[PDB]
Amino acid sequence: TTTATRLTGWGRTAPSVANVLRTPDAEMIVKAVARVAESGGGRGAIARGLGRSYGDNAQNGGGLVIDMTPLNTIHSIDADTKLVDIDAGVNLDQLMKAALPFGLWVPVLPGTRQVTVGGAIACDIHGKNHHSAGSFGNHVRSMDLLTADGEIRHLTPTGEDAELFWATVGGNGLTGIIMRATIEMTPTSTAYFIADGDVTASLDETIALHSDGSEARYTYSSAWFDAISAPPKLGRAAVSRGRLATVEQLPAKLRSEPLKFDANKYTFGPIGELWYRKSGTYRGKVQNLTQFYHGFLQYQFVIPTEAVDEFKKIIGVIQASGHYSFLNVFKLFGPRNQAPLSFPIPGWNICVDFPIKDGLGKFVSELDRRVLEFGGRLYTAKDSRTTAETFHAMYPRVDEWISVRRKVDPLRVFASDMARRLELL
Ligand SMILES: Cc1cc2nc3c(=O)[nH]c(=O)nc-3n(C[C@H](O)[C@H](O)[C@H](O)COP(=O)(O)OP(=O)(O)OC[C@H]3O[C@@H](n4cnc5c(N)ncnc54)[C@H](O)[C@@H]3O)c2cc1C
């Protein structure tokens, strides 16, 4: 039934061999968990989605990995209740396509739509709209969770079982296997955005633009960030902010199908600086999703809002480090949710991408130290190399979480490389 496969995260690193069960049959999945649970705990099992996490959370060296992607049935979409009832293996692209004709919008979209609902819940994913909509877990109204004892529990965010619900959110598959879930969607009259763009000249401007109160006028907001240039150019950004369009705001050419989907010699001189300011500055531009969205070590952290000087310092440490990240996504996160292991907290969030090079491993450890000291944290979906000590200090509700985890899996039936590395087992 199960194939001995060699798995990595998206980052393609720290590989381990696991037995991969790949079946559309939910009964064969309940029975595999039943089959891991009688052998004491062994090296346990972990669910896997589309494998878009960069780290080691969806692999289990010498254990069972359950590929959930065949479980990809959309059960119902209701435009009156805004509810979708889907298998955990459906991905967000599939869901977005299916839901559009109902005037329904996926409430949190990450950078790639090739992620499963299970992965979205287990990493409590965030998107361009976090400050206004929170993260993925905020919009789950129920889920069905295959736990260690082979029973399927029906969890809701409030009432009985809320605790296990909120431990599952952001729990990296370590509470069991999400089989099915109900998501509340965001109503929309169009598949379009109305976007405003701005280009800042420095880090100070970027931060200033995100604290001048303008952010409250936008539901969606993110920025491409300069992390290579020396000050004052360091931290200059192309900001893209917006909100879903209404049909009255579409041009006539689009208004009849409102929900349908489908370096020269100047470049680094003053004419290019002008061109790029001009091209990046705009108001009320109508965009579809693709236009509005757009050997390596991926690293993402958030620093709490107040610690602005500390955030500025970390960015300085980054550019003077001799490690050059060209692709950097910046955003200001809004209020957190009640999940103990949820990554997002209100504050300055950035994702960087370092070429793998001599000194890099030791430099990001130092980064960890700084991020930790400044009260922020790393994102498990990007990580495969931080220590359990650092992680546990970054997430002070980890003991709270672990304690919930030991109630629901005393025999450690669910386990992964990440769980063992970060001592979440
Ligand atoms: C190009 C790119 C851009 C990205 N942008 C963003 C972004 O903007 N915001 C953001 O928050 N993230 C982003 N991510 C990270 C990604 O959204 C998460 O890593 C997500 O969890 C991946 O989903 P997956 O289905 O691929 O799950 P996998 O990577 O296969 O697994 C991820 C985790 O979820 C658990 N899991 C999966 N299915 C289940 C299940 N059925 N039951 C229980 N647990 C399960 C796994 O055990 C594992 O712990 C990005 C990733 C990439 C590659």
From Swiss-Prot:
What GO biological process terms does the UniProt entry carry, in alphabetical order? capsule polysaccharide biosynthetic process; cell wall organization; response to antibiotic
| Disulfide bond as UniProt keyword | no
Location comes to:
Periplasm
- Keyword annotations: Antibiotic resistance, Cell wall biogenesis/degradation, FAD, Flavoprotein, Oxidoreductase, Periplasm
Cellular component (GO) terms are: membrane; periplasmic space
Instruction: Answer yes or no on keyword Cell wall biogenesis/degradation.
Output: yes
Entries under Gene3D superfamilies matching the protein: 3.30.465.10
EC numbers listed for it are: 1.1.98.3
Q: Which residues form the FAD-binding PCMH-type domain?
A: 13-188
| Domain of life (superkingdom) | Bacteria
EC class name: oxidoreductase
Substrates-to-products reaction catalysed: trans,octa-cis-decaprenylphospho-beta-D-ribofuranose + FAD + H(+) = trans,octa-cis-decaprenylphospho-beta-D-erythro-pentofuranosid-2-ulose + FADH2
Positions bound to FAD: 47-57, 111, 116-119, 123-126, 178, 379
**Which InterPro entries does the protein's record reference?**
ALO_C, FAD-bd_PCMH, FAD-bd_PCMH-like_sf, FAD-bd_PCMH_sub2, FAD_lactone_oxidase-like, Oxid_FAD_bind_N
Q: How is its activity regulated?
A: Is inhibited by 8-nitro-benzothiazinones (BTZs) such as BTZ043 and PBTZ169; BTZs are a new class of antimycobacterial agents that kill M.tuberculosis in vitro, ex vivo, and in mouse models of tuberculosis. Is also inhibited by dinitrobenzamide derivatives (DNBs), which thus block formation of both cell-wall lipoarabinomannan and arabinogalactan via inhibition of decaprenyl-phospho-arabinose (DPA) synthesis; DNBs show high activity against intracellular growth of M.tuberculosis inside macrophages, including extensively drug resistant (XDR) strains.
Please name the GO terms that the record assigns under molecular function: D-arabinono-1,4-lactone oxidase activity; FAD binding
Pathway in which the depicted protein is active: Cell wall biogenesis; cell wall polysaccharide biosynthesis
Assembly:
Monomer. Although forming apparent dimer in crystals, DprE1 does not dimerize appreciably in solution. Interacts with DprE2 to form an epimerase complex.
Main function: Component of the DprE1-DprE2 complex that catalyzes the 2-step epimerization of decaprenyl-phospho-ribose (DPR) to decaprenyl-phospho-arabinose (DPA), a key precursor that serves as the arabinose donor required for the synthesis of cell-wall arabinans. DprE1 catalyzes the first step of epimerization, namely FAD-dependent oxidation of the C2' hydroxyl of DPR to yield the keto intermediate decaprenyl-phospho-2'-keto-D-arabinose (DPX).
Q: Which family does it belong to?
A: Belongs to the DprE1 family.
Designated name of the protein? Decaprenylphosphoryl-beta-D-ribose oxidase
| Protein encoded by which gene | dprE1
